[PDB]
Amino acid sequence: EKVFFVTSPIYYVNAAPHIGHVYSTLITDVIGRYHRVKGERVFALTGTDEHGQKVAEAAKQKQVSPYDFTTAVAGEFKKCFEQMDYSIDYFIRTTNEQHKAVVKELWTKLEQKGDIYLGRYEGWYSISDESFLTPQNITDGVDKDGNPCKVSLESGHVVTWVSEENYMFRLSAFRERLLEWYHANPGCIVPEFRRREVIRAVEKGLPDLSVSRARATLHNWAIPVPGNPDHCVYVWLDALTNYLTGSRLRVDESGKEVSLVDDFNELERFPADVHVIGKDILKFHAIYWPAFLLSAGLPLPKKIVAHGWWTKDRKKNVFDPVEKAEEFGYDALKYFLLRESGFSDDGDYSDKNMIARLNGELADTLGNLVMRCTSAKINVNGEWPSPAAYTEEDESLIQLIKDLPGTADHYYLIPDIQKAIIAVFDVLRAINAYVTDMAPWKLVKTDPERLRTVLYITLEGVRVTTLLLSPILPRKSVVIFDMLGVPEVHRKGIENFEFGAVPPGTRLGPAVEGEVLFSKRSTENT
Ligand code: MET
């Protein structure tokens, strides 16, 4: 097989990192984490998009060199992402000398294949989105001065007219084939309604894309077109190539890049198994990216998943990812974002709701359940008991726990992480209802033979749910497993998705004094 290759979009370094970037990368991170938990080879990629007019003109407005500015902001992105405790394998920068090489090579391939020609683009362009737009996608709006101007219907930013001699990619010639690709691979774009957006857009027709810009326009802050120093490679063709680059970089233990391989196969990563993106950058990944790859005779990605947030921009609920993490907890925060947000963001991100979920699901449902099946009160010998005979209620719960991995697996592979969490927690609420009925606290006295059966199922339930919640709560899953005393070997691998991987007689971990797994926040805000 292959290295499971998951990516996030590489973010413009025009401004400090914020929740949006963190969320996108968090999705990339989780998908990665779950595949490692299945014991697969993983390579999760993230990074910054440093070239372009947008970034150049942000660096100019802060009275600083593009090189110095992008290094600065890039550093802030890395710091942020380190604080968030992702398990990302590499942070790429499009200023990397080796990335530049891949871009020049891809361009040459495109030119050699006959799909790049010298023409003009005369039309609208949004600098903030670095996006060509047709007149149907612009409208009337207000310049930040206050004067009347034209803006993008998509994003809302100011659009400007551009008339330039540019190099043009023959995107038009790839309509028939992109349509074949969407139809033949109906999981390739997720969620389904966005997939239908891409097909209708492409069905309507595709014009040629301008893959270069005049040197001056971009303030010489971009990759030169091979064989034409007066032009620069479109920031987006540059940016997209990051995926091919990352697939070709050998990385040391520091996470520093040490070599660029000649051919993507050497590292067994390309094409991406999943590109995590946001809704604002769909066309670049679903239309251009493959059209480029089809031209160069490279393989197409397997899945693009486009979540409900804007990868860029400040909208809505002011969140500092790190200040909320320090406030409510890191794993708790990540859980909250992944649980509360589905594919259309009808999400309630208020403090009230965060507290309600942390208290509700993380403390009451998961938390209380862990503390019960490890309590000296209930689990008197601090060990995994041997179950006696199973009742029909016993087996009904066992069935749920046995089916959870199959279900959770599918949801992660769509991927729909929200559905995966709900799936797991459905099984947790069930376990709690079982314990409530069985009153194990009473059985300690009455029927110890029975309690063995009840404790074992509860323990195994907790174990398997926690295993499946480990890509969401990576730190707290370790705290859980320590409490249950699960050996390191049983914390990973599809072998341990099975009911009863941990044998009876396994001892629980040391009970720490005044220990709380998820501490309850104050429900009463006023
Ligand atoms: C190849 S993904 C590029 C995304 C772009 N830099 C953004 O921040 O939206």
Side-chain angles (χ1 to χ4, degrees):
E1 75 286 338
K2 182 195 184 296
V3 177
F4 181 86
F5 179 27
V6 53
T7 65
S8 88
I10 62 185
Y11 315 100
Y12 292 123
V13 289
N14 66 282
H18 54 67
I19 193 57
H21 314 116
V22 163
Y23 178 79
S24 287
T25 292
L26 177 59
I27 296 193
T28 304
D29 186 46
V30 165
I31 292 163
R33 279 170 175 281
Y34 174 74
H35 286 269
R36 292 194 208 97
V37 163
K38 289 175 76 175
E40 293 170 7
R41 299 185 278 164
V42 181
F43 186 80
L45 184 60
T46 190
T48 56
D49 201 352
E50 317 209 330
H51 295 145
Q53 189 166 0
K54 178 183 186 65
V55 169
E57 292 187 25
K60 194 77 214 295
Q61 277 155 40
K62 293 285 189 103
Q63 324 202 72
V64 169
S65 171
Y67 300 87
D68 292 334
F69 184 69
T70 60
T71 297
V73 173
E76 288 163 27
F77 265 80
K78 295 206 198 190
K79 188 173 166 195
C80 184
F81 291 179
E82 273 145 32
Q83 274 153 318
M84 294 293 96
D85 195 351
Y86 298 130
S87 187
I88 293 294
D89 292 289
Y90 188 72
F91 195 114
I92 195 151
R93 296 177 66 198
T94 72
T95 48
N96 197 56
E97 200 55 33
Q98 275 70 242
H99 170 76
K100 290 192 209 277
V102 174
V103 173
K104 295 191 208 175
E105 196 178 298
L106 170 48
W107 178 281
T108 290
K109 193 76 210 214
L110 297 178
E111 204 282 326
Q112 292 297 334
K113 218 80 204 174
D115 291 325
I116 289 184
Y117 70 91
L118 192 62
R120 291 190 74 78
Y121 178 86
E122 300 189 21
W124 293 101
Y125 193 85
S126 163
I127 296 197
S128 181
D129 307 315
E130 300 279 19
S131 178
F132 299 106
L133 305 168
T134 57
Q136 298 85 52
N137 303 308
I138 76 160
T139 189
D140 294 299
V142 68
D143 177 18
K144 282 305 313 182
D145 270 319
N147 274 356
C149 68
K150 295 288 195 153
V151 299
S152 169
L153 277 180
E154 296 177 339
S155 69
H157 296 101
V158 173
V159 303
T160 53
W161 192 262
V162 164
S163 193
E164 282 178 28
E165 199 165 67
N166 289 355
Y167 282 101
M168 302 299 276
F169 174 71
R170 291 183 194 278
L171 184 60
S172 78
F174 289 86
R175 175 170 175 280
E176 202 194 310
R177 279 177 281 176
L178 278 176
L179 289 182
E180 280 156 26
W181 181 63
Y182 307 135
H183 169 68
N185 306 264
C188 71
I189 303 167
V190 174
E192 180 55 14
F193 77 94
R194 298 209 167 97
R195 178 170 154 275
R196 285 195 314 266
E197 285 169 20
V198 179
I199 294 175
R200 287 189 304 253
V202 168
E203 263 167 13
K204 292 224 143 209
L206 288 192
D208 291 348
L209 182 66
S210 160
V211 301
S212 85
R213 297 297 298 279
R215 181 161 92 94
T217 317
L218 304 183
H219 313 291
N220 305 260
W221 188 243
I223 295 168
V225 167
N228 199 333
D230 288 327
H231 291 237
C232 328
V233 176
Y234 183 17
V235 68
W236 268 101
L237 171 52
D238 166 23
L240 288 163
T241 305
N242 93 82
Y243 303 139
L244 182 42
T245 303
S247 75
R248 281 169 60 178
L249 292 184
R250 268 185 216 284
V251 189
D252 71 24
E253 293 183 324
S254 310
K256 191 208 189 60
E257 162 263 301
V258 305
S259 184
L260 176 65
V261 304
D262 294 337
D263 185 71
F264 68 90
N265 296 272
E266 274 162 56
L267 297 187
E268 288 159 277
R269 295 173 194 159
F270 203 82
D273 290 277
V274 166
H275 289 296
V276 182
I277 66 173
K279 63 194 190 188
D280 65 314
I281 58 161
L282 189 34
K283 68 180 187 187
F284 311 96
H285 295 81
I287 313 200
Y288 302 162
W289 186 219
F292 292 137
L293 296 162
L294 288 163
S295 173
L298 292 173
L300 297 181
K302 290 283 158 174
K303 278 156 184 289
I304 296 156
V305 51
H307 57 70
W309 292 40
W310 301 79
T311 48
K312 302 176 284 290
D313 215 333
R314 307 311 309 272
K315 304 183 191 184
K316 284 196 159 191
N317 294 356
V318 174
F319 245 55
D320 176 22
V322 183
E323 268 182 30
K324 279 289 178 206
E326 297 275 296
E327 174 63 287
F328 297 128
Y330 280 84
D331 284 6
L333 175 54
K334 293 165 177 178
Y335 171 84
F336 184 81
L337 300 185
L338 298 160
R339 175 73 194 74
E340 180 58 36
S341 78
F343 279 92
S344 188
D345 62 343
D346 53 297
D348 176 359
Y349 303 88
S350 60
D351 292 307
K352 185 166 169 268
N353 200 40
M354 288 196 277
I355 291 170
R357 284 203 190 282
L358 181 152
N359 285 348
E361 303 135 42
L362 297 178
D364 293 321
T365 294
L366 174 52
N368 194 236
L369 200 43
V370 171
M371 299 295 187
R372 268 163 177 183
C373 60
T374 62
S375 182
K377 193 184 183 183
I378 302 178
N379 189 334
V380 186
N381 306 111
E383 59 157 20
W384 288 63
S386 278
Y390 296 142
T391 71
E392 272 296 348
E393 185 164 344
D394 293 337
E395 283 176 350
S396 86
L397 178 62
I398 287 163
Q399 198 55 269
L400 294 185
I401 296 161
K402 282 165 102 168
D403 297 350
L404 186 61
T407 308
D409 190 54
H410 287 299
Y411 291 138
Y412 274 116
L413 292 170
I414 294 185
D416 188 331
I417 300 147
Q418 187 182 61
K419 283 211 207 327
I421 294 147
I422 289 166
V424 170
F425 269 80
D426 277 341
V427 168
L428 279 170
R429 284 181 282 275
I431 294 162
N432 268 304
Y434 176 75
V435 175
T436 282
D437 280 2
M438 296 298 133
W441 54 87
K442 287 175 169 161
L443 297 169
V444 194
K445 316 171 141 217
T446 323
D447 196 348
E449 211 211 337
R450 181 82 194 113
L451 180 50
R452 284 195 274 108
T453 312
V454 178
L455 245 175
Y456 178 67
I457 294 171
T458 312
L459 276 170
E460 182 67 3
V462 170
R463 182 188 76 73
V464 171
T465 48
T466 296
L467 177 59
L468 290 156
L469 286 171
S470 61
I472 315 311
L473 303 151
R475 294 306 192 191
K476 300 288 194 183
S477 54
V478 176
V479 176
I480 292 154
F481 286 140
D482 285 7
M483 287 182 184
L484 303 191
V486 173
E488 268 285 297
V489 67
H490 293 293
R491 302 187 179 191
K492 175 186 206 172
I494 63 149
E495 300 95 346
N496 299 292
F497 281 9
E498 298 183 69
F499 185 87
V502 175
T506 301
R507 297 231 287 278
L508 300 187
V512 188
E513 65 178 25
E515 189 170 21
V516 288
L517 197 65
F518 288 100
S519 184
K520 283 207 183 208
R521 295 291 172 285
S522 183
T523 54
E524 193 169 38
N525 283 6
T526 48

